[PDB]
Amino acid sequence: EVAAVVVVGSCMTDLVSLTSRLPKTGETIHGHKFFIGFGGKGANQCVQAARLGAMTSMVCKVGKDSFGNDYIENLKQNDISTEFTYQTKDAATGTASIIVNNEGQNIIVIVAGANLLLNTEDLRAAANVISRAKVMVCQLEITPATSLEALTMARRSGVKTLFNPAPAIADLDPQFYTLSDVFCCNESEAEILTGLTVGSAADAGEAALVLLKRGCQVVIITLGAEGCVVLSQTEPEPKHIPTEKVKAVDTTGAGDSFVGALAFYLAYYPNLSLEDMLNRSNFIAAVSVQAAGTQSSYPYKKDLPLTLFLEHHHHHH
Amino acid sequence: EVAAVVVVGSCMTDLVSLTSRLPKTGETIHGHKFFIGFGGKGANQCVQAARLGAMTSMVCKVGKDSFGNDYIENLKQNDISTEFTYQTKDAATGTASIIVNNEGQNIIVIVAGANLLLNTEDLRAAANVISRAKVMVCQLEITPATSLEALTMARRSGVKTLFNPAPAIADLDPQFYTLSDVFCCNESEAEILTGLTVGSAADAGEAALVLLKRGCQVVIITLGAEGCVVLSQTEPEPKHIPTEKVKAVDTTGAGDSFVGALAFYLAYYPNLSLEDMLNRSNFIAAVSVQAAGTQSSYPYKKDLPLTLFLE
Ligand SMILES: Nc1ncnc2c1ncn2[C@@H]1O[C@H](COP(=O)(O)OP(=O)(O)CP(=O)(O)O)[C@@H](O)[C@H]1O
Ligand SMILES: Nc1ncnc2c1ncn2[C@@H]1O[C@H](COP(=O)(O)OP(=O)(O)CP(=O)(O)O)[C@@H](O)[C@H]1O
Ligand SMILES: OC[C@H]1O[C@H](O)[C@H](O)[C@@H]1O
Ligand code: NA
Ligand code: NA
Ligand code: NA
Ligand code: NA
């Protein structure tokens, strides 16, 4: 009955137009393809955890609109609990409108909409699910104050906090660091948070140490094809966890796959070393980059080697 | 029960994001509102004409998708004939992604989908209705060859041709000029068609004269808050027709309101001067800019001054 992974965050309808060029102010242009996808960092993370076998619950707000109805059905199709998936008449379901040219350069207009109306009253009603989970996951796509209250509730319940400061803003409220058991971001988010350049594993180590000293317990910087770099209060010397060369088709939502995998390991394989968890998380996110379509690319257990689900240490998947 | 205004053209689902600025290449920006609307230049024009009291027929193609089913219901709710509104499983209902900033400037990305499957066989079935109409209206959101055939059919029956070259193509087929009784576009479309700058009513006059010489009978360039400029083969001196002074909330589809009003007046008030018709058409379009969306903002006859319907 009880969800082990609770995600408090964002659901967004992806509205994607492919064109030969991006438009200038005042321009009407013809694209050659349009498609609707299920996105939002919160839902993407929740979906990857659910597909690995996690019992998950998605605490979010969508609209009382067709896109919101379709989102609830998407979460139920991935066996995600929608008990505290709220629907509001007061705004539309969140949108990410994405225009992509032939070369892969894009413009993105996000309207967070109903996501921003998820409030502290909504979290109090969800308090039974949040307090009884193993892991609480949050990002920066809903109201900051709401993510902070979710982190506060999880901390006082002894629930592990996994925070993804995405998208990043430079002067983040210091409590996001001190309430984070695991603080996981990418290279460009690390640059925004620290003002430092991340062009190597060594540079990622230096950025992670800045983040650790602001009060995080564990800091992970994802490095795309370079894997990730990790350190912690107990082991402050950074480690580089590389990942084998694969043929990337579409990396969109790779970080969300990585975070959802990590939530799954924290919740169901708590005795694995952190480096083992991240090595597994790298392999699962690298499966996602080998196919198109964000949530569509996130593998299920049946599609993955069984060594990813061993109760003891295992290195090569 | 004869349709006086036949529109051969586009239906789109409008997916609209309101933002404080437009994004540059590589940029993610956060807007403050998202909404769905029934759009497409053809359907917008047809809806404005219908709401003024025109008997209209919409010749178009949508998808056998939820958006297309919703579109057909939208046309029936505006009392538009859907006799020649077709549905295809081989392409989705057209989409227009619209980003609008707080100064009212926009970018639009159209994926025309089922619009581009409306073909000359689909037009042939409408031959009787086109031959009995007063006005045929076309734009550039379907296959150009299909609009050219609709204008050709209209010209054969002596039906008035109203052509809106929107969105504009720099290399427009010369027959769009010679088949147009009334050729109506906005400032930026006039720039694309002529390669001239249009930064004033005087500049619009010069662009309109280039368009007149390519063989249009009448050229109208819409000028947003400045109203429109018109000239003709009989009176090639440009005339500036100002519009009503109003507070603009959402100008999206203002030109479609203007063109639908123009279609209504050509069909039902044929003896009005061009200046009178554009006076009226400006007033109606100026009502549309005072509210959100395209069709949702288009006024009905009952809500407009009586004098717009007198002669
Ligand atoms: N080209 C590639 N080959 C193998 N694995 C990759 C990869 N790109 C990404 N990954 C995997 O996904 C994780 C996250 O990737 P990345 O650092 O690019 O995050 P991201 O998707 O958040 C950046 P963005 O926000 O721009 O999409 C990596 O740590 C790695 O495990
Ligand atoms: N700010 C405003 N105030 C009053 N009337 C306006 C207006 N903007 C537009 N209109 C009316 O709408 C008509 C059409 O205007 P315009 O040519 O800007 O529309 P449009 O929708 O075609 C331009 P675009 O494709 O760049 O959005 C004008 O002739 C005028 O009557
Ligand atoms: O003129 C406005 C229309 O043009 C685009 O086609 C949109 O669908 C919108 O409704
Ligand atoms: Na990410
Ligand atoms: Na992918
Ligand atoms: Na127009
Ligand atoms: Na309007």
Curated annotation (Swiss-Prot), chain A:
Main location as per UniProt: cytoplasm
Catalytic activity: D-ribose + ATP = D-ribose 5-phosphate + ADP + H(+)
EC category: transferase
Catalytic residues of the enzyme: D256 (proton acceptor)
Keyword Nucleus: yes
Any one GO cellular component localisation term in the record: nucleus
Cofactor(s) recorded in Swiss-Prot or TrEMBL: Mg(2+)
GO BP of this protein: D-ribose catabolic process; pentose-phosphate shunt
Positions that bind substrate: M12, T13, D14, G40, K41, G42, A43, N44, E141, D256
EC number: 2.7.1.15
One annotated GO molecular function: metal ion binding
Gene3D superfamilies the record matches: 3.40.1190.20
Residues the record lists as binding K(+): D250, T252, S288, A291, G293, S297
Location in the cell: Cytoplasm; Nucleus
PROSITE patterns on file: PFKB_KINASES_2 (PS00584)
Cofactor note: Requires a divalent cation, most likely magnesium in vivo, as an electrophilic catalyst to aid phosphoryl group transfer. It is the chelate of the metal and the nucleotide that is the actual substrate.
Annotated positions binding ATP: N186, T222, L223, G224, A225, E226, G227, T243, G255, D256, N282
Signal peptide: none
Similarity comment: Belongs to the carbohydrate kinase PfkB family. Ribokinase subfamily.
Reported function: Catalyzes the phosphorylation of ribose at O-5 in a reaction requiring ATP and magnesium. The resulting D-ribose-5-phosphate can then be used either for sythesis of nucleotides, histidine, and tryptophan, or as a component of the pentose phosphate pathway.
Subunit structure: Homodimer.
Protein name stated in the entry: Ribokinase
Gene: RBKS
